[PDB]
């Protein structure tokens, strides 16, 4: 099983940071501790941070959506009623605006209100089917409710897929030095983690759905699944959940090309999705990031809000998190991965675990190494590996080829 080639040379595992924290000047007036970060993005509406731009629902043309909260239908609410000619024109206007100069980066299109496959629209997303029936009734009265509901599915699938394929293809052939992709695709659906006898193993039908959603993967360049966490799970439950999500995200990458699979930039968060103020301790970071470094992903993209990046106390707390927990772990895993490559593979790629249903990881043995901070904030790594570390890695782990270094 091969793997994608690195976008930036001398970096096999890449990090992206997409949050509006570009304003706050960290601590001691130092603006940026982002040396480890190859790509830095800013979602502010007027901002022009090239690295990782992202077009939300409110931009990039005339995207239709019925607001779930009490609100009005916008641009029709269904992909059936859209002009499909003004959309591409305003999208061209937006593409001209948000990247006047062509530069390397990844653009993500954040559109989730409806899902382009029928039968994934259980409550509260049943609305897009209600309307999808009644419109047909307003065109023909011969057909009963059964026939109207049947023909509803043939005015939402075609509509949505012709929407998104074209919204990409005005991006892929125009400014191809960027990396285009939709947010949160694929998905597997793990919501049964409270019932007894829980194993996160995605149910059969969801795998069938994403397997037959194969038309979209042939369009985008990069994938961006979500490996979010909440505080209702247990250690084993969280490990299995993350493991299976990422494993599916890696299996869906075999289809668009079977020799040089895509880049998977795991969209993650450093905050619990149930409590949006409590960070992840190091053990949670293990089965969030280390389970990703150790399964073959091309990199990790973190995401934020303004919830933890507006107040100055928030700036201080995030500065402490960066200087105590996150950056040391980033160097830990990255240096483990680069050492794996250079020693055990001769840099033919990145190494991937033998049996995934296991708690093996890519970490630096504390009895040999020392990751420290010298004065000035530039990290330094001291120490070299022993032979026993390489032996245990070469038994647990194994390597595989790159897309260019086979």
């Amino acid at each position: 099983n091969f793997r994608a080639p690195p976008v930036i040379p001398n970096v096999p595992f890449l990090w992206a940071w997409n949050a509006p924290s570009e304003f706050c000047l960290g601590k001691f007036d130092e603006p940026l501790d982002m040396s480890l970060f190859s790509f830095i993005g800013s979602p502010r509406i007027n901002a022009t941070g090239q690295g990782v731009t992202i077009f939300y629902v409110d931009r990039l043309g005339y995207y239709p959506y019925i607001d779930s909260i009490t609100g009005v239908t916008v641009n029709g609410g269904i992909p059936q009623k859209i002009s499909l000619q003004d959309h591409l024109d305003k999208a061209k206007k937006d593409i001209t605006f948000y990247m006047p100069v062509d530069n390397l980066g990844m653009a993500v299109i954040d559109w989730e209100e409806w899902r382009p496959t029928w039968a994934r629209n259980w409550k509260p997303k049943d609305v897009y089917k209600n309307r999808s029936i009644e419109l047909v009734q307003q065109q023909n009265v011969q057909l009963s409710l059964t026939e109207a509901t049947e023909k509803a599915k043939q005015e939402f699938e075609k509509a949505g897929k012709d929407f998104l394929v074209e919204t990409i293809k005005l991006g892929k052939l125009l400014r191809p030095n960027h990396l285009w992709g939709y947010y949160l695709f694929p998905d597997c659906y793990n919501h049964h983690y409270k019932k007894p006898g829980y194993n996160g193993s995605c149910f059969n039908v969801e795998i069938k759905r994403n397997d037959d959603l194969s038309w979209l993967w042939n369009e985008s360049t990069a994938l961006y699944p979500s490996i979010y966490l909440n505080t209702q799970q247990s250690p084993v439950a969280a490990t299995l959940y993350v493991r299976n999500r990422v494993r599916e995200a890696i299996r869906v990458s075999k289809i668009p090309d079977a020799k040089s699979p895509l880049p998977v930039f795991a969209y993650t968060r450093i905050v619990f999705t149930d409590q949006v103020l409590k960070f992840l301790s190091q053990d949670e970071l293990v089965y969030t990031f280390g389970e990703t470094v150790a399964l073959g992903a091309s990199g990790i993209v973190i995401w934020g809000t303004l919830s933890i990046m507006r107040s100055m106390k928030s700036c201080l707390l995030l500065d402490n998190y960066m200087e105590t927990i996150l950056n040391p772990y980033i160097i830990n895993v990255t240096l483990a991965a680069k050492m794996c490559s250079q020693v055990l593979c001769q840099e033919q790629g990145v190494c991937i675990r033998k049996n995934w249903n296991s708690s093996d990881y890519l970490h630096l043995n504390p009895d040999n190494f020392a990751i420290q901070l010298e004065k000035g904030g530039k990290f330094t790594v001291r120490g070299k590996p022993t032979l026993e570390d390489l032996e245990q890695f070469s038994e647990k782990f194994y390597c595989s080829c790159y897309s260019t270094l086979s």
């Epitope: 040999n368 001291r382 120490g383 022993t386 032979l387 390489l390 032996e391 070469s394």
Partner: antibody, heavy 118, light 111 residues
């Protein structure tokens, strides 16, 4: 930079001894240091190695007798239970940092002679 | 127990090109194996600082080659200027159980 050994002398069986190795032109936190011995008319034998993080590695024939240490400038070796089998010339080697995950020694010293007799 | 064995222990090859001194092992060693040269009465000198890479200042066009558990150092240009005794050492920080340096090789030149 330079590497210079010292401390080699005459000793009596059953005792203990200490050697020093002095450096100039660099720092001990960026380059590692190794101790090797050579018996007269025989081969080199590996006594130990000191990493950049303070970790000390020895060979299994030497564990329980030998101990290395560092300072701001000098790297010292200390030994115990001296018999007639320990007569040799002791060198001090510096790692020239050709590789990021292995030790390779480029700058050597001159050597100190240790004589064990009654 | 990591045991590294040198054969031969003394080579006698006239002017021309002489043999490649060897080095064996019992635990897998990828590429951390260095070769040194020592004339009598002098400290050694680093010649090959991997299984194959030469250091600056090696005009005798040496070239080492190998990987796995068996390794060699080839003496391409031998004259009355390259007479010494050679050695192989494992380059990774020694495991708990180790034996790094070998039995040594000697070069006899029949001028």
């Amino acid at each position: 930079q330079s590497v210079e050994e010292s401390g080699g002398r005459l000793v009596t069986p059953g005792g203990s001894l200490t050697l020093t190795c002095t450096v100039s032109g660099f720092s001990l936190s960026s380059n590692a240091i190794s101790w090797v011995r050579q018996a007269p008319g025989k081969g080199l034998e590996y006594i130990g190695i000191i990493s950049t993080s303070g970790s000390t590695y020895y060979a299994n024939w030497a564990k329980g007798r030998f101990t290395i240490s560092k300072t701001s400038t000098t790297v010292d070796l200390k030994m115990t239970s001296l018999t007639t089998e320990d007569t040799a010339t002791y060198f001090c080697a510096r790692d020239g940092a050709y590789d990021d995950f292995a030790y390779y020694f480029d700058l050597w010293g001159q050597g100190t002679l240790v004589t064990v007799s009654s | 127990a990591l045991v590294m064995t040198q054969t031969p222990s003394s080579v006698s090859a006239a002017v021309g090109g002489t043999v490649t001194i060897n080095c064996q092992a019992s635990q897998n060693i990828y590429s951390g194996l260095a070769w040194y040269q020592q004339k009598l009465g002098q400290p050694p000198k680093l010649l090959i600082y991997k299984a194959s890479t030469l250091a600056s200042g090696v005009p005798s066009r040496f070239k080492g080659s190998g990987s796995g558990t068996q390794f060699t150092l080839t003496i391409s240009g031998v004259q009355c200027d390259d007479a010494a005794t050679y050695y192989c050492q494992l380059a990774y920080s020694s495991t708990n159980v180790d034996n790094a340096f070998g039995g040594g090789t000697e070069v006899v030149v029949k001028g």
